[model samples]
Target: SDVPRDLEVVAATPTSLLISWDAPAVTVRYYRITYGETGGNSPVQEFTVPGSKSTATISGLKPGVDYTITVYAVTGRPASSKPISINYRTEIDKPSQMQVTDVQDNSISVKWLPSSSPVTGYRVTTTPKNGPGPTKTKTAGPDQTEMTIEGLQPTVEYVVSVYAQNPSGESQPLVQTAVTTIPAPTDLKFTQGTPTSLSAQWTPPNVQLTGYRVRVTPKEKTGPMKEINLAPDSSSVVVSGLMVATKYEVSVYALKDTLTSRPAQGVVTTLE
Candidate 1:
């Protein structure tokens, strides 16, 4: 008999599906596969599989749509067996409006819009920028639009990918770049002081940084607070242009872009 058996259609990607079936009891010249949108005006497309193979992937189909496929065995005179039909849909479109935030010393938060199709769940992957670092993924329920990935290292960068999943297959990834939080300066104090000014210094954190900020205000509640910006490699600065033997409150901060760490603070009086 020329009728192929157990025809199967499986979704492969957003625009393709793998269609296959068992060979008939009798040998045939080849096979012809045709497909189109089920019950619609979609133009029917066809392809042939040589007698040696029983499976082929058909692509360029519309995503998130219903499709029908048929397969038939071929013999001499281009004859065909009874056609076998299967119904399936390509994968849905990718998730939308993804946002990555709450980057702490050991965690990151990811959120995205749910699928418009019949969604099964969501998936998140965090890949560290450093080579040899472990990559991780987590799954969320159909109702979930938010997820938090833990066990991260501070100051490390990651490439985050968010995906939507369905019975058919998964969607394209929505990608974002994320970096862990940075620590602040410590051991704030005044050193190398003179009657007219005081030099400020602080211990640096154990991470790469953008820079530091040193701020000093007069103890007497007067105006004109001094704000000093320092280099990323620096831990100290000479606070010049101050009144002689004056008391002032000082603070130092560690900075990464617009984010700042907990401040190290102290008070000091200029040398007499």
Candidate 2:
């Protein structure tokens, strides 16, 4: 009697199939499988299992189609088993959802929610709302939660969206629009009158300012840019540098939140 030849096709995807077979009790030379669609030739795709190999893959198949598959067994001397037929379909498309979380000067952060269990990944897109009409797109892995976009011009608006992407297709787009924060101040300036005293002031911009901070450097050394946080109500702050006929660059800024207005620069040449 000949050993039975039965194989089960498992783990079928759009591009590949994993098939497993049981070892035959009899001396089996190899195995072969052929598959095709209706009204087409049954492409005689063969798999050779030297000395009774029990597993193989049928791959490079089209997506979302009902395919007819057949498997048969062969002894080294002669073809032994009749072909067995089964039908299987490929994987479907994935979809996703994206949202905007925070917008700041020069940049914005975006997030997209996880998709249904069937989805494998997501697609995210960001586009300018006005001027230039540029767009950027990105693909997120199956488990990604969020992404950030940087290097944007401050005080501008943009549209952001996320969609589910899978073998079937992309889902309906989820979109949000937001304006980035206003530009920060530039050209900050700091000044000191003499070693024992300092005066700091900045050119106030036409744009409204909350207030200004006056800071003095002790002995004027190179290091971190130390700031004068606490100062009197008057714009002029006095600190000690103790040298006459010396000019120092002044730093001044108007600030809101962590963002600050451009520093107004002024050169103060001390009296000799």
Candidate 3:
């Protein structure tokens, strides 16, 4: 008798293939399936299924490779027809070895190893630690293993994940944590000064500041530099007891935890 008719590839993944066939016209006890790459002298893998079974899945296959699959029927000894053959290929495999290269106050850079199989692109997602804001995602080409994500909050903790994707589907996600940097204050100014005192003011940065540092130095060839600490919320300060007609360079620094921002500077001369 003849084998099953209308053999077809039902579905497939990077490492597996599902195949099915129409039931044979004649009653059969069992069937045998054999499959392997074409033009290869290597022996094919074999399987035995009950007469009622019309589908079989082959595993351990390589991605993006064509293979020759054949099916045989057996009602009794030496009573089977020629095998029915079909060709199919598996899907692309997932990417691997993802890593984070750099993180900043408002951005994150990431990279990953390429997939052995052909790929189309990658997808990246970023979420905040406190879990209140909306998550951000980006899509990149297959050749692009490295990506940079932006518009993040300063000094905030975030969870980042990357997935390798192809025409088939997305691979497992690689995840990591990142923290943004505290930003420096801007526009420091000095004004309203008498010989005895001077006032300083500035605009605060976007991120929170734990404290502030005020460093004052006489631009003159001789005079001691003075340092002062201020509360986090105070964006202005006044300095008193200064010599008349003395020039001073004043610098303000914003502090967050142990991190310190770049100095914002202003110069003023006390009136004689």
Candidate 4:
């Protein structure tokens, strides 16, 4: 009736990883810890800690690898000991040096570099990351950590992250992933004529593309596939039913992470 030891990590984040242990005196009914990554043995994911409160939050993890932890407990049989190793290392991509300079009328301007080590401030996020958008996050409070971003939506395409917190550790959420603000031509452009329909106009491809997939062929190629996606910052779109004097061939592409670009075409002839 005695199985407890010293096991600690305390905190880590890329996804999350926190642990703390030290409980023993038999009569236990739970406590099982086992982690992997860092010796390349793989397979050792077991954690059932709830009571005895020793902290635990080892989430999805996989931001940079290098993890190896251990902890165990459980009464009724299965009294195993000797596995209190700790070795964590996540969040290795500190990107500082971001400045967006003043751009009034609403707000847009910034600064960076307040993290050299033990951080406990910084977390700003802005999303527009190129076209059809939905990415916005803002948080800057650690004694005026420098900021100026308000009521955006002019020519958007933002991606910002500066997470370097403290209390245990948190330095590596620094991301200037994207930046774009200055687009008000009607927000960029969007047209879908109806004289015979087959209109298209776009704008929002300076960089940071993770969404945009459209294709419409017909110029003696074939038919039955009028894809669409001119919605986030929508440059322009207008392909109504079609078939009047037919002769269309429109292509558009933009994707990231699996890589796929080189297809931005347009050619119409519909005026029945």
For 183-211, candidate 1 gives per-residue lDDT tens digits of 66777766778886788777899888888
Query: Each model's TM-score, in the order given?
Result: 0.67, 0.41, 0.59, 0.28
Give Cα-based local distance difference scores for all models: 0.82, 0.61, 0.82, 0.62
How many Å off is the CA of 42 in candidate 2?
A: 36
- Using alpha carbons, what is the TM-score of model 2? 0.41
Off-target runs (Cα >4 Å) in candidate 3 are 25-27, 118-144, 152-272
Q: Write one digit per residue (lDDT tens) for candidate 4, span 54-145.
A: 66888887754678877766665465555567888765334368776665323567788665444545667666676766655666665545
Residues 164-195, model 3: lDDT tens digits: 77655566566778777766678887758888
Worst 10 residues of 4 by lDDT: 181-190
Better of 3 and 4 by TM-score: 3
Instruction: Show where candidate 1 strays beyond 4 Å.
Output: 9-11, 23-30, 37-43, 49-53, 62-66, 76-78, 101-111, 131-151, 165-173, 187-195, 208-236, 243-272
Which ranges of candidate 4 are over 4 A from the true structure?
1-15, 18-28, 32-68, 76-80, 84-86, 92-101, 104-109, 116-154, 161-272
lDDT of model 2 at residue 14? 55
Ranking by TM-score: 1, 3, 2, 4
lDDT of 3 at 72: 90
Candidate No. with top TM-score: 1
The CA-based lDDT of model 4 is what? 0.62
